[PDB]
Write a protein that binds this ligand. Structure first.
Ligand SMILES: *[C@@H]1O[C@H](CO)[C@@H](O[C@@H]2O[C@H](CO)[C@@H](O[C@@H]3O[C@H](CO)[C@@H](O)[C@H](O)[C@@H]3O)[C@H](O)[C@H]2NC(C)=O)[C@H](O)[C@H]1NC(C)=O
Ligand code: ZN
Length: 281
């Protein structure tokens, strides 16, 4: 059992919110965490007609942040078994989408939208990959086990696409060492699974799908979605920097040509809404 602590798992970020009270989820500040709570709450309220069940199902989704799990059985290594029978859908819920069944309903966490990412700064804009030391926060030491990390394909759109096996690429597969936590770790466990993964860079928000799979007959696996984005450096690209190899003039602090219409002036914004008139109905 456990969850991704660095970058933080989507469901772990939600479980740090005040979801216990008020019971309708209005104490949850993050709009996507609040929508995930309210999705399961409204789903269960509409099927059973019981508010107590709606509250319990929605709370369970965030209380079980360390149990986003699925049982694969002895053939946990069989890719088609995982993709078609164990976690065929609702990947960020580890396939759990039924409140009265084992693992409940965590499908609110799998909805699309403006999930808040961990923003990773780039050291250099030509970096193809960023070696990032991932931290998995185990609430129990389960060995033998291994970790797989997937990343969404380059054109994945977090606002509208579901994370599915068809839009995920495997970037890491290894046994990871159980190590001491580094300073300022948000993991509440005493030891952690820390591992250096080369994360492919993206210009838009991506999702890492981390799978912690036990190698045993029961085959319990833990699956978490991790929202990430990349902060590019501003200015000209390093390869386009021509340096000079060889009267007193100064620029002022005056707002040059203030009042003249142009880019980012109110005229430009008003013009844009007229240019987008065919986009409104
Ligand atoms: C990540 O790496 C692990 C470790 O190499 C991969 O697990 C291994 O996967 C292979 C192929 O699915 C398994 O082989 C199969 O074993 C069964 C039983 O012995 C045999 O009947 C098959 O013919 C085949 O040889 C292998 O057992 C398994 N290893 C362990 C320790 O579980 C895993 O597939 C990799 N993940 C991805 C996404 O590729
Ligand atoms: Zn466990």
């Amino acid at each position: 059992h456990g969850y991704m602590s660095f970058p933080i798992a989507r469901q772990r970020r939600c479980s740090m919110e005040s979801f216990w009270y008020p019971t309708n989820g209005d104490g949850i500040t993050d709009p996507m965490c609040r929508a995930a709570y309210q999705y399961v709450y409204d789903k269960v309220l509409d099927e059973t007609g019981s508010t107590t069940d709606a509250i319990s199902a929605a709370q369970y989704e965030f209380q079980q942040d360390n149990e986003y799990a699925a049982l694969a059985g002895p053939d946990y290594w069989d890719k088609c078994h995982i993709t078609q029978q164990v976690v065929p859908n609702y990947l960020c819920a580890a396939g759990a989408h039924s409140w009265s069944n084992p693992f409940g309903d965590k499908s609110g966490v799998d909805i699309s939208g403006s999930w808040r990412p961990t923003v990773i700064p780039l050291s250099d804009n030509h970096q193809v990959s960023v070696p990032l030391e991932l931290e998995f926060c185990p609430t129990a030491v389960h060995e033998p086990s291994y970790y797989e990390v997937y990343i969404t394909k380059p054109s994945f759109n977090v606002f509208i696409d579901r994370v599915v096996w068809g839009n995920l690429d495997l970037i890491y597969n290894d046994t990871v060492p159980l190590d001491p936590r580094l300073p300022y770790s948000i993991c509440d466990a005493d030891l952690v699974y820390r591992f250096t993964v080369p994360i492919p860079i993206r210009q838009s928000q991506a999702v890492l799908y981390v799978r912690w799979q036990r190698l045993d007959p029961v085959g319990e696996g833990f699956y978490n979605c991790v929202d990430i984005n990349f902060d590019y450096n501003n200015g000209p690209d390093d390869e386009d920097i021509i340096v000079p190899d060889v009267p007193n003039q100064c620029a002022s602090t005056f707002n040059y040509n203030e009042g003249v219409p142009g880019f980012d002036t109110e005229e430009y914004y008003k013009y844009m809404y007229e240019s987008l008139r065919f986009n409104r109905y």
